Amino acid sequence: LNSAQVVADVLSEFLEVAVHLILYVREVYPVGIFQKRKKYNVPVQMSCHPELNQYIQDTLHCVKPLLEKNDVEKVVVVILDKEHRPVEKFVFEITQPPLLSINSDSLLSHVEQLLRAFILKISKVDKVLDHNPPGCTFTVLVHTREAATRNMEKIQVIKDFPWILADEQDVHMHDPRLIPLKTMTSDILKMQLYVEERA
Amino acid sequence: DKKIVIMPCKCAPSRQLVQVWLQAK
Numbered sequence: 503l504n505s506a507q508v509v510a511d512v513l514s515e516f517l518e519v520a521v522h523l524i525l526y527v528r529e530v531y532p533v534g535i536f537q538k539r540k541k542y543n544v545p546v547q548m549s550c551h552p553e554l555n556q557y558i559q560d561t562l563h564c565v566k567p568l569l570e571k572n573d574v575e576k577v578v579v580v581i582l583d584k585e586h587r588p589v590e591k592f593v594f595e596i597t598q599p600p601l602l603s604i605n606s607d608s609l610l611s612h613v614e615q616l617l618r619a620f621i622l623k624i625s626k627v628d629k630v631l632d633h634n635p636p637g638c639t640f641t642v643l644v645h646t647r648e649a650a651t652r653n654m655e656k657i658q659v660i661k662d663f664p665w666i667l668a669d670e671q672d673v674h675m676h677d678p679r680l681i682p683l684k685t686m687t688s689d690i691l692k693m694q695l696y697v698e699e700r701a
Numbered sequence: 702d703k704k705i706v707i708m709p710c711k712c713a714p715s716r717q718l719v720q721v722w723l724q725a726k
Contacts, residue, residue: 551714554719560709641713644708663709668706
């Protein structure tokens with residue numbers, strides 16, 4: 503589909519903005535590399551560190567194809583402690599329609615409004631979430647059907663950025679305290695965002 | 702065919718590398 507390209511693009515920049523902001527609000531990186539920026543008419547924090555920015559973009563460019571052929575279920579930004587085990591998880595459940603309309607009009611400016619709300623919620627999450635333990639790092643998990651990864655092969659080699667199966671310990675969460683943030687729905691995208699904290 | 706969780710082989714730059722980068726103005 504051609505309208506899938508645009509939903510994969512739009513969704514991709516959103517995820518990048520979200521990731522940059524989640525890294526900010528959860529003190530995963532030194533406050534100083536983050537710069538004030540503005541997307542969806544809202545103030546955000548984008549990083550100015552070369553490699554970090556390239557790491558996040560290389561990650562999203564690999565998801566882009568999975569997003570097109572509606573192969574993404576959950577895109578998760580996981581925060582780990584020195585024990586190298588999950589402390590927090592920002593789950594973005596995703597599902598697009600079986601097919602996308604060829605009557606490509608500006609119902610997208612409607613998506614921007616919906617997206618805008620996720621950004622704002624993420625910006626306040628540090629109010630309902632205690633401070634994480636020092637020295638945490640992040641990773642990105644992506645939930646798909648083992649067969650749709652075929653769409654990823656070519657681009658992994660392109661961006662020279664390989665992926666691999668996740669080990670159930672690398673994902674495992676204790677309990678955990680589910681904290682819902684936002685849930686949107688629409689002609690092209692139904693998305694939900696919630697946080698998983700540990701005890 | 703069935704459910705799977707995937708992630709990048711490469712690890713994000715360590716908070717330590719970033720600090721050195723920052724302190725160097």
